[PDB]
Symmetry: D2
Subunit: 217 residues, 4 copies
Amino acid sequence: MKIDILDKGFVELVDVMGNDLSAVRAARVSFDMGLKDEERDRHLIEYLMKHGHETPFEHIVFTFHVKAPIFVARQWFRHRIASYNELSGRYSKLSYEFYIPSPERLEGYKTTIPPERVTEKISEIVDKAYRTYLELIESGVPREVARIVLPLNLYTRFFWTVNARSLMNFLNLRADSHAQWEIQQYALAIARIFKEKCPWTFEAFLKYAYKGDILKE
Amino acid sequence: MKIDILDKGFVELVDVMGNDLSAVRAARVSFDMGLKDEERDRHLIEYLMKHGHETPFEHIVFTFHVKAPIFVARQWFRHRIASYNELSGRYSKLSYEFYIPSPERLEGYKTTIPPERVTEKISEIVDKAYRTYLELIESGVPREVARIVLPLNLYTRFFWTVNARSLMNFLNLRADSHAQWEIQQYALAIARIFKEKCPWTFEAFLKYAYKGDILKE
Amino acid sequence: MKIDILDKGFVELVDVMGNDLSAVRAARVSFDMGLKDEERDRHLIEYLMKHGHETPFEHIVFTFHVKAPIFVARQWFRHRIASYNELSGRYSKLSYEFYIPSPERLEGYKTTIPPERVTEKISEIVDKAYRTYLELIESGVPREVARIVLPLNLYTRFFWTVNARSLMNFLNLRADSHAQWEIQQYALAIARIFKEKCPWTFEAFLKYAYKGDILKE
Amino acid sequence: MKIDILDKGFVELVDVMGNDLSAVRAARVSFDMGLKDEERDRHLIEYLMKHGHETPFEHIVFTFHVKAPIFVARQWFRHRIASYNELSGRYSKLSYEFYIPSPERLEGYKTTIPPERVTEKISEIVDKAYRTYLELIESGVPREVARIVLPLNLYTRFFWTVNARSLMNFLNLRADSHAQWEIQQYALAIARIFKEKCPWTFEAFLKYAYKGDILKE
Ligand SMILES: Cc1cc2nc3c(=O)[nH]c(=O)nc-3n(C[C@H](O)[C@H](O)[C@H](O)COP(=O)(O)OP(=O)(O)OC[C@H]3O[C@@H](n4cnc5c(N)ncnc54)[C@H](O)[C@@H]3O)c2cc1C
Ligand SMILES: Cc1cc2nc3c(=O)[nH]c(=O)nc-3n(C[C@H](O)[C@H](O)[C@H](O)COP(=O)(O)OP(=O)(O)OC[C@H]3O[C@@H](n4cnc5c(N)ncnc54)[C@H](O)[C@@H]3O)c2cc1C
Ligand SMILES: Cc1cc2nc3c(=O)[nH]c(=O)nc-3n(C[C@H](O)[C@H](O)[C@H](O)COP(=O)(O)OP(=O)(O)OC[C@H]3O[C@@H](n4cnc5c(N)ncnc54)[C@H](O)[C@@H]3O)c2cc1C
Ligand SMILES: Cc1cc2nc3c(=O)[nH]c(=O)nc-3n(C[C@H](O)[C@H](O)[C@H](O)COP(=O)(O)OP(=O)(O)OC[C@H]3O[C@@H](n4cnc5c(N)ncnc54)[C@H](O)[C@@H]3O)c2cc1C
Ligand SMILES: C[C@H](Sc1nnc(O)[nH]c1=O)C(=O)O
Ligand SMILES: C[C@H](Sc1nnc(O)[nH]c1=O)C(=O)O
Ligand SMILES: C[C@H](Sc1nnc(O)[nH]c1=O)C(=O)O
Ligand SMILES: C[C@H](Sc1nnc(O)[nH]c1=O)C(=O)O
């Protein structure tokens, strides 16, 4: 299932290893691989989360395919405890696809030009930049030099493999009102997928370990 | 499938995410999820491996359950780019299970006592240590203090989650004649499992990137 | 300065890069390298710590030389975000040096044998194990096989390089009453050294980010 | 000492812990802290490097202050085993400073427009983008939204703390002809600083472990 984000972005879960019971089996180092035992297994998940013993959650791993603007992916790729592979503008021609904020993005700010004209000015400069990029590529300038004139709102795409512990750290920092609005919108989508795949771990994280201010209520 | 190792140890693969095509899809950042394309896909695997572009292989992840003596697990747990959860002797009573080397373990060494008597002397001291451990536990000494008299050949067990890149590094260093014989035997089992699960990546690693001296021939 | 710990262990700081002002300079990405500005600089340290923006503290790094029993170093070396180099019993003959708990270590536990006799039983088994180790080494058994009969209370030594962020994580988990008493004693020494070298960061950590129950009061 | 790089960038070493003898002391776990012993100490450095036992080099750490264009820092920040703190365009107004390639940058490429006109077209679009950025900031658009129209050749600055092992990995991959020319120029400067600070380790790395094709001759 692809979740759409911003005007042209998305997050899609591509693969997953493990579930809530992976963490309990790892915590106990279990020989037995039987079915769910809600009461016992949820209490252990909560105990782990309540005490900060979160290494067992490293045994649940996700791989996502994300399409986001470069300024969002720069913040995302600061999360070092993860694996990333991104589309390179050294080797491929980059598509004309840019994030243009909605006039609502400026809610709460008083400006001396209308919000619709801000939107138009952004659209205008990114069209001029893309025209220069394509003029340089079609004149024989190597892609890795021509691409440096493109703006930070160009969309890129990457695959991200991350375990549930590092993904909880990502939600603490990016599903939170101090994070920039655009990456919050991605962190809300990732949280919805994590909740679907690992409901006990997700509920325990919100009750005991989640440090942000958006996911609770 | 559990592979037996040493006298009482084992390695068992518990879960796996991804396969050879996970690495090619990540390297290309592919939208398409079609079937194997041997020729193209193997060449890209080899190119990546030949040039040291190994981040795509981080998207293939394995979880193993391992039973090994403490002196082997101490060497194993030096591999930091992985996740481990081990059985704790603070919280559980530890089983009477020790690695006793076969008289063949001393092949090539001239000793002043017969190899069968070395085996017997090891058996004897570990029986005396275990008897002291149990004497202290049954007198009310806390487990976390009583266990300090047990020797390094006691078996322990742990779950290990590792991606294919870190597992190639583990094979470079532990499937190699400079590593201690006992952990080589574990690295040979892990290599057999990796070869079964990811044959193109495994064959490419042996041809281009494997630095050890045991897996080739 | 070497701080003694347990009966024969120690922690000694060998080298340090940076101080509290390293973290403020990194947080601001400062061109200027002037002297302390207590008021401004302490407030920024507190703000960082209060909000969990702890990457600036990664720019302060310490190297320690530690002598500890093997069962303490096994818990220590679970901290993956650090560098370790340990003395190997494959390549050197290991010294007769073991941790023997004081009769006070059993304070609060009712036992069926006197605490002085527990101490004596531990001393006795480690002497028997060391005698077997030396008997095997002097008969020509290779060190890497003979050492497996030594108990977990043998002392080892290692160098540990760690930045201030990872060292705060180590104190959260090891300077705390749920950690085993022996590693608490090491974490208290490391905390004293960190406080001497980085007083503003240390005081800010206790006020806002320290999760344990021993360092405060 | 600041080394200038490109038209307006630089690399400057801000702090360093350790030297070649830090690695030998860590490898031996030495109690003694005496002076250089060239013959013995260089042979051990070479042996470590020749066999891939590079953990001792993690005990030498550097902190650099780097000013580079965003497209170079995006490649740089893929190196996860390091610490970074960068100037944020959410919180500060960004300076009008862009990398404009010299007409020599296109050596070897046949183009349908003169190389001097490529230079002029780049200058022109970045001036138009900066004018839009400043128009939005002075109309009251928040900085974190206005900055998304700036191109990837805007310069940024960051502090990078890295140990000598991770810095050898960085040189293997970035001091090499497959890396983009602009980051090669930064990797050549970093190599010159590493050679000055750690000459035996640097010479051993070139002789045995350096995988690139630029630093040797
Ligand atoms: C609101 C906000 C403002 C920000 N402002 C800036 C800014 O102005 N400039 C800037 O450069 N960045 C800024 N960042 C980025 C921030 O500094 C972190 O790089 C990013 O949040 C990733 O967090 P992390 O280090 O915890 O994650 P990861 O890198 O995924 O690390 C996960 C955990 O592993 C541990 N860890 C990983 N590597 C190390 C290491 N080498 N040493 C010690 N522990 C380690 C730490 O416990 C860490 O929490 C900001 C982030 C937020 C959310
Ligand atoms: C034959 C042999 C003899 C040994 N002898 C000793 C000994 O006497 N004493 C001793 O203490 N250990 C010894 N070791 C352990 C060895 O020092 C390593 O700790 C172990 O081999 C793990 O290797 P690693 O660091 O590459 O793996 P990981 O820790 O899994 O790291 C994987 C890769 O990530 C990178 N990396 C991870 N963390 C860091 C970091 N903080 N800085 C820079 N790069 C990082 C490096 O590229 C590393 O190769 C020996 C190992 C072998 C095989
Ligand atoms: C009281 C107590 C009881 C314990 N009991 C057990 C037990 O029974 N069995 C057991 O096996 N261990 C046990 N441990 C060890 C514990 O599981 C951790 O391994 C140890 O505390 C190191 O913590 P850490 O992972 O936070 O530190 P590090 O490994 O130094 O990591 C620092 C931070 O980096 C991040 N990080 C590093 N690597 C990863 C990764 N691969 N994925 C995601 N994040 C990462 C996390 O933010 C982490 O907090 C116990 C520890 C304590 C204190
Ligand atoms: C010529 C060139 C072309 C490139 N093209 C692309 C591209 O098209 N797209 C793209 O996304 N990137 C590309 N890269 C970036 C490349 O994929 C690496 O991200 C970058 O080179 C950092 O290398 P590293 O992972 O070895 O370094 P670090 O991230 O510093 O890791 C150091 C070492 O630690 C180990 N390590 C660290 N974290 C992990 C982990 N989670 N799992 C296993 N081992 C780990 C590995 O041994 C690693 O070598 C390219 C780089 C080069 C030089
Ligand atoms: C270079 C920084 S990194 C950073 N800056 N602010 C955030 O909120 N998150 C981040 O990761 C930026 O986006 O301006
Ligand atoms: C403490 C060291 S660590 C180590 N020593 N030698 C190895 O061959 N591998 C390792 O990891 C040991 O086993 O003696
Ligand atoms: C194998 C585990 S690891 C561990 N166990 N309990 C702790 O308190 N700390 C740890 O790191 C042990 O010491 O028994
Ligand atoms: C997004 C990628 S990352 C990368 N791409 N090519 C490189 O040579 N180095 C890199 O790190 C880029 O710069 O286009």
